[PDB]
Design a protein around this nucleic acid. Structure first.
Ligand SMILES: [Zn+2]
Ligand SMILES: [Zn+2]
Lengths: 121, 121
RNA sequence: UAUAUAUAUAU
RNA sequence: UAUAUAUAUAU
């Protein structure tokens, strides 16, 4: 459907665009592009676990100064070291109207969800 | 809508019927009749509190022999003494089919909601 | 991602 | 009844 903006729920900075979001194993969400990389910062995870093919390695936060909002975690998937975000950490903004939407769960967010793909990478 | 049975989620005993349920201030639920009063027991509330029109005085549980499953509270609303239940403690069973539903919030339970009325009482 | 327990705040 | 924080279980 419509491409939208994901903003940091705390400082409202543009984190990324739904178009760059990919779905892993139908329930986890990752973001593509070197752009989102300059948008978050990591920190070793207090209790790194391994469920299915992920290995919870660190935690991620908004890179902005006085913000540092918790955005989820960073993991090791297939051969990939990628981030995994929670929508509860951003504000979705319709680019046309400016209307903002607060989701707590990725299930309620009905955008065109695109499967993750190694090939892209 | 359909008149249904309310069973104790724990021991599955019959607590009441939706016909006898009355909604208060549009978000609080009580049950009418003496019959239901015989289905539960109460204990003076540990943390009694007063809120817009109620005065939380006690906690009510399933009176059934070896269950005593927490069912909600018992309050002083206006000049009355009525029990306030949470659907979370019950199993809604459809009488005609026997089908059962587990609600966590009354907002999701869609039956015919008769507003509490002093004239009845 | 989800399940469960626990206090704390509001009417 | 609604919100917020906190630990444990699961993949
Ligand atoms: Zn931020
Ligand atoms: Zn019971």
């Amino acid at each position: 459907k419509e491409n939208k903006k994901l903003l940091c729920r705390k400082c409202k900075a543009l984190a990324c665009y739904t178009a760059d979001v990919r779905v892993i194993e139908e329930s986890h969400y990752t973001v593509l592009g070197d752009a989102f990389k300059e948008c978050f910062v990591s920190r070793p995870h207090p209790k790194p676990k391994q469920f299915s093919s992920f290995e919870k390695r660190a935690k991620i936060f908004c890179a902005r100064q006085n913000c540092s909002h918790d955005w989820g975690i960073h993991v090791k998937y297939k051969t990939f070291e990628i981030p995994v975000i929670k929508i509860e950490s951003f504000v979705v903004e319709d680019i046309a109207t400016g209307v903002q939407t607060l989701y707590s769960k990725w299930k309620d967010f009905h955008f065109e969800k695109i499967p993750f793909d190694p090939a892209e990478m």
